[PDB]
Amino acid sequence: NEKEKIIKKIAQEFDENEKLINKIGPNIEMFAQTINTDIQKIEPNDQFGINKTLFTEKKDNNIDFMLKDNRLRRLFYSSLNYDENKIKKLATILAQTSSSNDYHYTLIGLIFWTGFKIQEAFESAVNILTKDEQKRLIFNFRTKTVKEIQENFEKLMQERNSWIKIVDNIIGEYDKNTGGCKADGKILGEVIRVGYEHELDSNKSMQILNNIETPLKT
């Protein structure tokens, strides 16, 4: 009954893994469907204002990636739950920022970058955690690993939500007219830089992803 002992433990690990997975499984299925629905959307011809008429080509690499690639623009739109009004409003707000040293272009770029990188990490995690993979986790992994993965997934969900809140706060400065930024594109750039540049962080997302990926290659 070394056998009986091991069998009881295995049955308990299946039971507890399943509860951990059941916490994220319904969500992942919804997110996968939502992602597919966003991918199928027709982008408007104006690209919600994220085009070369409003953001000059060749000022920032991350701006240029957005101007050039509709799939990176789709990621950025999905990073904001494809809220069209919000996307258009942000784009309008950004296209009127200004500065002396052109740094506003770097800030614009890091905003676009942060959004498409967070959504890319999020969608990769969603795409990796298929039903088959979830079943693989339940039946073949120690409960400690399954817990780390489930909680790292919830962490990634939160990163994404904190990113949305940053954008909401940036729009909020403009709506409040902080420092009279509505009338001055330089004031607006500085409002956004000082309030929010340090807040931008797609590195954390991508590390959380890597920590979900590395146990899975087992």
Report which residue type is found at 159. Answer: E
SS3 content of the chain, % helix, strand, coil (to 5): 80, 0, 20
Residue 179 gets the label, from left (phi > 0), alpha (psi -120 to 50) or beta, of left
Rounded-to-integer distance, Cα 187 and Cα 190, Å: 5
Which residue is it, tokens 């399943």? 18
- In this structure, what DSSP letter does residue 218 have? -
Residue pair 119/78 in contact (Cβ under 8 Å)? The answer is: yes
Please tell me the distance from the alpha carbon of residue 182 to that of residue 185, in angstroms, as a whole number. 7
User: What technique solved it?
Assistant: X-ray
Q: Does an H or E element contain 35, and which?
A: helix 25-40
- Domain 1-218 in CATH 1.10.3160.10: yes
Residue 71 in tokens: 């799939």
Dihedral-angle region of residue 58 (phi above 0 means left; psi in -120 to 50 means alpha; beta otherwise): left
| 25: three-class secondary structure by DSSP | helix
Q: Where are the domains of the chain?
A: 1-218
Q: Amino acid letter at 29?
A: E
**Reported structure resolution in angstroms:** 2.1
Question: 79 phi and psi, to 5 degrees?
Answer: -60, -20
